[PDB]
């Protein structure tokens, strides 16, 4: 189709950092009868996933991604400066979770909803619940749409969703943070999930008590201890650490913290496949940057030792180690 | 003065969270002969400062600011989808420092440069030097334009500017992070500063050391110093005793920020950085029902620990004097 050609031309503009070409392409596609929603979901969204794949593989830098993403935002704005219908359906507030800076997925949702006649107030990146809740109380929208892209944000998602529901505002949720097929929204009972902006719009067209886990609490309270334990194990087993400068040591510490935090998220939703997928993803990220993924196994074994009398955490760690071992046999 | 009226109408749209009205206003102003640069600098920029004032005073929430800022971004895009000239002058890369997420000031610079015929690649928020440097080596732009809004980022700015210069790329710098009249850029010799997008464009139209041990100590001992501040608050500041996890975390975050701004102040050896930060902090906290006297408690505790660091000691003294003076009026 013209969509194959459109994707190639769009990626070429994004890779070149050429905002005018990307926007002009989008406008010409609209002029030729390509639906706005198709430009946003089949062209822009698809390009952004691929940019992520390239970054993950260390084939693109952060600068290259940033250039592209900013242009994709301009494409989304240009397309919405044309496809938006007069607001006749009601009012939706679109917000990212506190600590969630992937605004572009949420912007696509906002634009698609506007195209169907919703009045949308877009709040975008990182809205604290303490500020979002009074905003919902102030304006009483028909729905709040909460976007989460990182599964590590799932504990926060659960809290923010609960707080929003307590205002009586219907909650829609989405983004990659709930998993590609919405699994972690369903596990949490977190609002109504949908996979895409199109599906969100379809939902809106219809005629329509959580005890703390001490094991999760321990992963938060003992984070520094666990990072330190991982580092000490790397000191014993992983030779490159001995020659790391400040920058590489800081990256190691950052990554160790992220390992603990994803383990915490996995335990929170009690789905070991969160930690499993995280560990295999981490292996790919590190390998692509010349860091042996065996380093991860060293850290996981060390954390498992410290927490071996925490049965749920132990199970998740075991699952992570098995997933890594399986990944590394290729 | 259509600009007085324009400002009122714009702020009304922003306060209402009405993107269509704000964009339509901008377009009507352009249609009536208001220069694009005027819409961006005299209307949009001015509104964003005022949103900052309202937030600082706890009169606007984060949600209210976020709604407004996203609309201002759409105004900037709409105005640039009209005012940008064909690229004929050369190539500028526009980037925020690593850890700097105020992209909008940099977007205004980008749009104004495009209006003067520059090809601009906008990288926006938070670009690590390790990624920016190879990008500059790859593309050899005529300049890189670095934006910094938070003075706490100044030590990083100094390093990133040096790294960019080492690629042979001329560096322009700006944003609030370089201080009043660019003072902190100028004392460091960190690139060529300019106050506004207009002035940046004007510059482009022309024919063109030992590590700091006191700074190092403020970074290395950050946790210790936060803890010292907290222990003093425990001894002297009654509300802390009744704080839940959330308020305790906010206290800890703020104490860290106090240390980090002290580090920046010492780094550029300008006590007025720390002084202005402390008085700003007092206003922020007071507006949220937290006694600014709490800040004095923390500062006195940090001064005790670091009393044999002469530069740091001086900056802390200056901060305490600035706070005392602020609190008598
Ligand atoms: C651009 C980008 C960034 C940008 C985003 C800026 C912006 N303006 O949004 C920046 C640079 C800020 C960024 C930062 C980071 N990111 Co990033 N980034 C991306 C990237 C490449 C594209 C995102 C995008 O544009 N999505 C647009 C399209 C693709 O979204 P979409 O899913 O089709 O959207 C639909 C659905 O999600 C759904 N939906 C979404 N929200 C909602 C809400 C509701 C209510 C409903 C019903 C539906 C719904 O409907 C949408 C529209 O149809 C992705 C790759 C990816 N696969 O997403 C990563 C990716 C998400 N990032 C990733 C990472 C790791 C990071 C960082 C941690 C990196 C770092 N160390 O700094 C940080 C974290 C920042 C934070 N705290 O959030 C990883 C996350 C992997 C993981 N471990 O979970 C990814 C997946 C890349 C990868 N590794 O392959 N990132
Ligand atoms: C919008 C906003 C945000 C948004 C920004 C999103 C975005 N898309 O940019 C978000 C929510 C992300 C944000 C976050 C925060 N912010 Co804020 N925010 C603002 C606000 C209200 C407006 C910024 C803006 O739109 N500027 C547009 C206009 C006003 O910029 P301008 O100065 O006119 O731009 C010109 C010049 O600076 C110059 N220039 C700028 N860059 C360059 C570069 C070059 C090369 C040149 C030549 C010139 C140049 O030319 C420009 C164009 O003419 C300001 C208020 C303010 N006074 O700026 C604060 C403000 C900057 N934020 C502030 C704070 C404290 C924060 C947070 C720390 C809050 C928090 N705890 O989360 C974080 C920090 C995030 C980070 N790490 O960077 C404070 C900082 C005070 C301080 N201590 O330094 C301010 C001053 C608000 C206040 N207190 O009054 N913020
Ligand atoms: C357990 C052992 C372990 C070690 C030894 C480790 C080290 C490590 N990680 C690095 C980078 C990195 N590591 C990550 C990983 C992540 N980014 C994210 O946002 C998330 C969630 C992850 C995953 C945990 C990334 C993306 C970089 C590259 C940083 C950059 O942009 O330059 C680097 C720098 C690479 C270089 O400069 O050569 C080192 C040394 N990480 C580890 O986990
Ligand atoms: C020394 C004593 C000291 C104390 C006791 C302190 C406490 C403190 N600061 C708070 C919020 C806050 N404190 C800040 C301050 C900042 N935000 C920034 O980005 C920066 C740089 C600052 C300044 C340091 C802000 C903006 C909030 C509001 C956070 C929110 O909205 O949740 C709160 C929560 C208020 C409430 O919910 O009732 C407390 C308790 N801060 C202190 O510094
Ligand atoms: C998911 C996206 O996050 C971006 N990314 C990775 N590390 C950083 C960083 N330190 N600062 C800003 N953006 C970053 C990458 O460009 C990636 O594509
Ligand atoms: C400078 C701007 O930073 C925003 N701001 C303050 N705290 C947060 C936060 N936790 N998350 C996101 N934005 C925030 C405010 O809305 C302010 O206006």
Author numbering:
A (entry chain A): 7 to 214, 224 to 345
B (entry chain B): 7 to 214, 225 to 345
Question: What sentences appear in the manuscript?
Answer:
The adenosine binding pocket is strikingly similar, with the ribose moiety stacking with the conserved Trp61 residue and forming a network of polar interactions linking across the dimer interface via the conserved Glu71-His72 motif. In SasPcob, the BV is bound with a ZZZ configuration, with Asp270 forming key interactions with the co-planar A, B and C pyrrole rings. The D ring is positioned out of the ABC plane by approximately 40° due to close interactions with Trp296. In SasPcob, the close interaction and relative position of the B12- and BV-binding domains brings the two chromophores in close proximity, with the edge of the BV C and D rings within van der Waal’s distance of the conserved Trp61 and the corrin ring B, respectively. Furthermore, a direct hydrogen bond is formed between one of the corrin ring B amide groups and the BV ring D. This likely explains the B12 allosteric effects on BV affinity observed in solution. A network of direct and water mediated polar interactions surround this central chromophore edge-to-edge contact. These include direct hydrogen bonds between the corrin ring and Trp296 from the globin domain, and a putative salt bridge formed between the propionic acid of ring C of BV and His137 of the opposite monomer. The juxtaposition of both chromophores likely underpins the optical coupling observed.
